[PDB]
């Protein structure tokens with residue numbers, strides 16, 4: 001029963017399974033791509049080794065040379081860096097500063113490795129669902145620019161004005177399900193525990209790829 005085949009469960013929540021580290025705060029730096037990347041790596045590290053450890057977004061901000069540090073970046077590029085670098089440091093060994101600095105990677109602080117990555121077929125929410133169910137938390141990019149998104153508190157978020165072609169923010173899909181009849185994705189943000197619902201938002205699922213949720217989705221292989 002390969003990932004893209006067979007019975008995917010109705011709901012999944014990796015927070016309940018010890019796959020998800022505490023919600024972080026990226027601060028004034030535009031590094032959600034690095035927080036989304038470390039989130040997906042943290043999930044695979046837990047699955048592979050049984051240990052849950054904060055990995056270093058600053059390691060990615062400083063060292064993934066073609067990403068733009070606090071100016072944006074692609075999670076695919078972050079996974080490729082960890083593969084070619086033969087590791088990524090832990091948060092404790094390479095702590096978050098909130099601004100791009102010179103690369104200070106140290107193998108002594110290495111906490112995970114990467115064997116490559118796969119991308120979800122663009123716009124395909126069924127493939128994203130099967131990936132979350134079979135692999136673990138998946139990095140995704142969304143339009144987070146709307147006031148309705150930024151001041152979300154509860155419920156399943158849907159806004160017809162969300163622009164699936166304006167992928168301005170990277171987050172982590174840690175599960176999916178249904179709430180009062182409304183299908184959703186369970187999304188870990190990087191705006192602190194004070195944002196949304198303890199740092200999380202439920203985003204509409206199977207509603208025409210709302211906010212672009214399946215347009216730039218990927219996971220690392222480990």
Ligand SMILES: O=C(O)C(Cc1ccccc1-c1ccccc1)C(=O)O
Nearest residue numbers: 006007008009125126129130183206
């Ligand atoms: O197509 C989607 O995205 C799913 C549905 C689904 C996806 C993947 C594997 C199985 C199912 C499924 C179908 C019918 C009953 C129970 C489960 C959904 O609509 O939630």
